[PDB]
Amino acid sequence: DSCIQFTRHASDVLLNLNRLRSRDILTDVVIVVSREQFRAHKTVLMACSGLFYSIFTDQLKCNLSVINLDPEINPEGFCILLDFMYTSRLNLREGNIMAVMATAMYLQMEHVVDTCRKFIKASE
Amino acid sequence: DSCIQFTRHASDVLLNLNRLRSRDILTDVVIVVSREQFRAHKTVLMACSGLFYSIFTDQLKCNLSVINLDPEINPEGFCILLDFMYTSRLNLREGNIMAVMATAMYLQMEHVVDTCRKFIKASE
Amino acid sequence: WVIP
Amino acid sequence: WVIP
Numbered sequence: 001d002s003c004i005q006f007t008r009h010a011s012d013v014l015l016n017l018n019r020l021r022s023r024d025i026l027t028d029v030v031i032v033v034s035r036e037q038f039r040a041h042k043t044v045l046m047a048c049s050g051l052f053y054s055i056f057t058d059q060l061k062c063n064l065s066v067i068n069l070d071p072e073i074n075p076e077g078f079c080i081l082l083d084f085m086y087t088s089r090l091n092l093r094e095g096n097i098m099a100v101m102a103t104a105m106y107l108q109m110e111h112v113v114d115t116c117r118k119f120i121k122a123s124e
Numbered sequence: 125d126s127c128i129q130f131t132r133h134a135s136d137v138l139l140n141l142n143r144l145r146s147r148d149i150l151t152d153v154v155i156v157v158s159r160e161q162f163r164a165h166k167t168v169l170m171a172c173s174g175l176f177y178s179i180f181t182d183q184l185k186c187n188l189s190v191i192n193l194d195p196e197i198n199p200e201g202f203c204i205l206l207d208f209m210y211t212s213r214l215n216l217r218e219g220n221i222m223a224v225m226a227t228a229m230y231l232q233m234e235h236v237v238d239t240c241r242k243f244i245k246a247s248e
Numbered sequence: 249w250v251i252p
Numbered sequence: 253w254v255i256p
């Protein structure tokens with residue numbers, strides 16, 4: 001086509017989706033990770049994670065308002081990945097890298113798994 | 125903070141949101157523009173448009189599944205702007221610029237209004 | 249705005 | 253990945 005493109009559009013959309021999340025506006029699911037609960041938008045979760053894409057395209061699970069993750073999932077690891085989904089920013093630290101990598105593998109977030117593997121290999 | 129950032133993340137999220145729209149997955153509103161209907165995600169509309177941000181933060185309108193736009197709104201102009209919301213790409217042409225600019229003013233999409241004004245001024 |  |  002002969003379209004023009006607004007370079008910052010995708011980043012501005014994501015910034016607004018994060019603002020809606022922070023204000024709990026039109027959030028439609030709560031992700032339960034052991035004792036912790038995280039409110040989010042199903043569409044953002046599906047757009048970032050192979051696991052959520054699978055869950056919310058399922059004819060029964062698409063209608064659930066609560067999703068319980070595997071008890072082995074670390075809440076801080078999930079929190080870091082949820083923030084990444086809504087911001088493109090990953091708070092990767094020596095103290096959380098193993099939990100973040102395990103959570104990203106479970107959530108099927110290939111690019112995160114890739115940078116965790118690379119950061120781990122550099123430290124060995 | 126000491127975060128790392130994935131450059132293509134925002135663009136990849138938007139590409140997936142557009143894929144969900146094309147497959148009518150978790151769309152939660154229909155925008156009626158005279159004889160035409162457009163299915164979309166309320167969160168994407170709010171993230172792109174001052175008018176939809178206002179509508180869906182309203183305590184009564186947030187729950188509506190159908191929104192009827194002003195009869196003066198051109199369906200093609202709306203279609204072009206809806207595509208832009210989900211892609212960052214604006215199909216701006218001599219034959220649609222007036223309709224696109226009028227629709228962007230109504231929808232409160234300042235960056236679109238700006239490029240339409242600039243393209244019009246260059247042709248006079 | 250750019251030519252993509 | 254970059255340093256933002």
Ligand SMILES: N#Cc1c(Cl)ncnc1Nc1ccc2c(c1)CC(=O)N2
Binds near residue numbers: 049110
């Ligand atoms: N929503 C949506 C969606 C669609 Cl529509 N099409 C294709 N993938 C989608 N999302 C999704 C699927 C697999 C993975 C990711 C996201 C990130 C990753 O590492 N794996």
Ligand SMILES: N#Cc1c(Cl)ncnc1Nc1ccc2c(c1)CC(=O)N2
Binds near residue numbers: 233
């Ligand atoms: N969703 C959301 C949203 C939030 Cl949370 N905060 C601030 N603006 C939001 N969206 C929004 C408001 C005004 C305008 C636009 C988008 C594009 C434009 O030209 N005007």
Ligand SMILES: [Cl-]
Binds near residue numbers: 064
């Ligand atoms: Cl439920």
Ligand SMILES: [Cl-]
Binds near residue numbers: 048110111112113
């Ligand atoms: Cl990822």
Ligand SMILES: [Cl-]
Binds near residue numbers: 187188189190
């Ligand atoms: Cl309704």
Ligand SMILES: [Cl-]
Binds near residue numbers: 237
């Ligand atoms: Cl805009």
